[PDB]
Design a protein around this ligand. Structure first.
Ligand SMILES: Cc1cc2nc3c(=O)[nH]c(=O)nc-3n(C[C@H](O)[C@H](O)[C@H](O)COP(=O)(O)OP(=O)(O)OC[C@H]3O[C@@H](n4cnc5c(N)ncnc54)[C@H](O)[C@@H]3O)c2cc1C
Ligand SMILES: NC(=O)c1ccc[n+]([C@@H]2O[C@H](COP(=O)([O-])OP(=O)(O)OC[C@H]3O[C@@H](n4cnc5c(N)ncnc54)[C@H](O)[C@@H]3O)[C@@H](O)[C@H]2O)c1
Length: 401
């Protein structure tokens, strides 16, 4: 069960949500949190959004009030832990004893080889320090080159374009958001950005850089005042790999957050868990998972009677005039399109069914519909289809079932 003292490695959203719940759930023993970043815990979503505008870090901190009597060692790096001795080695020479150790060390932005040394600025966007460096070089008319058509990339493009900056983007795949988005949505998102002035380069990839210019695998090149790489992340599982835990670019855990090493748990971006919708193990790297999974695992540690994590995946993405929300899977048997798909009236909903069962949904500028659809997906609803394609009230249909 829950052996004290509790030691959490990492101080991001997963860590803060987990420790807050431990307390709320009634745990009153010792709790210590080790954060390598010398920063008061903050949320990352704003780093590519509003923060890029106001640059106010006090407007994006996380609320640790729900987590009383917790000692946060910020600026300190957990160098390793001994699972037999039940201790953690810190970078300041200290050692922390633990009864129950949690690894919520998240992940880190994948680096871009070829751009090794490329004279001009080259950043990744993961931290507040990153956010700050990039924000600086976002001077108007300047030229920004984004490598990666993922969510960080398109969110920065919108913010870069929204500030008089010029934007160019390179993607290796034939479409954007290849990772977790319906193709229907990607074609549109691509259409939207191109329309906002973004130079999209598909099936292209950066091969190098020679004096403030970038080389592409298409024999061509592109000039840029600053390059921001957004090509995915890698789990910060180095410590678990060394302590012999089971992992492969992410730590494997069950619905209780258990790793293959006794008394050691893991949550957040740093883990590969089961997707209840695809029945496959994968790394769910979303804000909702970071928070929801932390609480779930904390809730069960304090009370074994409580169920394991079961929340279904979903996430949002703010890209300029596009308020996107994607839940469940990106495809299935068929997809129903509620509303019209136009660059002028950007407002619509996509529903992904598998053999009649809703397995995913996408809401563009339509938050009213998201909540009910998540409810219907939550129960694998098998609603009409015709009533599902025409102006019916989902809140209601959801209410019916
Ligand atoms: C710019 C940006 C925008 C985003 N926007 C969205 C969005 O719109 N919607 C959405 O759903 N999600 C979004 N996300 C994703 C969301 O931020 C992540 O899902 C969430 O932060 C994952 O939390 P985490 O607790 O697992 O780990 P993280 O936040 O990575 O934190 C782990 C922490 O542990 C530290 N650490 C690692 N190793 C050690 C060690 N050995 N010792 C001590 N400390 C260590 C790390 O440095 C880090 O500070 C965004 C992310 C970024 C970066
Ligand atoms: N709105 C959101 O949900 C959101 C926003 C920002 C960041 N995040 C989180 O940030 C982390 C990483 O985000 P991300 O956007 O960098 O990654 P990602 O995996 O979402 O997207 C990376 C994109 O880069 C492309 N790519 C890969 N290698 C490339 C190369 N060499 N050149 C050009 N393109 C290449 C991929 O095909 C993919 O479309 C994840 O944990 C993610 O969930 C989420």
């Amino acid at each position: 069960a829950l052996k004290a003292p509790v030691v959490v490695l990492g101080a991001g959203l997963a860590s803060v949500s987990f420790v807050a719940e431990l307390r709320q759930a009634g745990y009153q023993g010792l709790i210590t949190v080790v954060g390598d970043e010398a920063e008061r815990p903050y949320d990352r979503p704003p780093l590519s959004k509003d923060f890029m505008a106001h640059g106010d870090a006090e407007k994006i901190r996380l609320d640790c009030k729900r987590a009383p009597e917790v000692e946060w060692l910020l600026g300190v790096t957990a160098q390793s832990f001994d699972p037999q001795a039940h201790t953690v080695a810190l970078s300041d020479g200290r050692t922390l004893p633990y009864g129950t150790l949690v690894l919520a060390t998240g992940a880190a932005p994948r680096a871009l080889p070829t751009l090794q040394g490329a004279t001009m600025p080259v950043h990744t966007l993961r931290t507040l320090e990153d956010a700050r460096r990039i924000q600086a070089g976002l001077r108007p008319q300047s030229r920004l080159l984004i490598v990666g058509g993922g969510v960080i990339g398109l969110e920065l493009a919108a913010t870069a374009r929204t500030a008089g900056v010029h934007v160019s983007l390179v993607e290796t795949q034939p479409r954007l958001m290849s990772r977790a988005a319906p193709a229907t949505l990607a074609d549109f998102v691509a259409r939207y950005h191109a329309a906002q002035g973004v130079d999209l380069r598909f099936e292209r990839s950066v091969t190098g850089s020679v004096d403030g210019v970038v080389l592409l695998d298409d024999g061509t090149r592109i000039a840029a005042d600053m390059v921001v790489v957004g090509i995915g992340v890698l789990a910060n599982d180095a410590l678990a790999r060394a302590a012999g835990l089971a992992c492969d670019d992410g730590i494997f855990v069950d619905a209780y957050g258990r790793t293959t090493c006794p008394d050691v748990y893991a949550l957040g971006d740093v883990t590969r868990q089961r997707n209840p919708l695809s029945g496959r193990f994968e790394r769910i790297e979303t804000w909702s998972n970071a928070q929801n999974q932390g609480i779930a695992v904390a809730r069960h540690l304090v009370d074994p009677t409580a169920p394991g994590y079961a929340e279904l995946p979903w996430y949002w993405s703010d890209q300029g005039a596009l308020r996107i929300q994607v839940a469940g899977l990106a495809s299935g048997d068929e997809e129903i399109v509620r509303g019209e798909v136009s660059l002028d009236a950007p407002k619509f909903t996509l529903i992904e069914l598998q053999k009649g069962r809703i397995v995913g949904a996408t809401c563009v500028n339509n938050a009213r519909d998201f909540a009910p659809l998540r409810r219907l997906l939550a129960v694998g609803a098998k609603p009409d289809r015709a009533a599902l394609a025409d102006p019916a009230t989902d809140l209601r249909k959801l209410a019916a079932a």
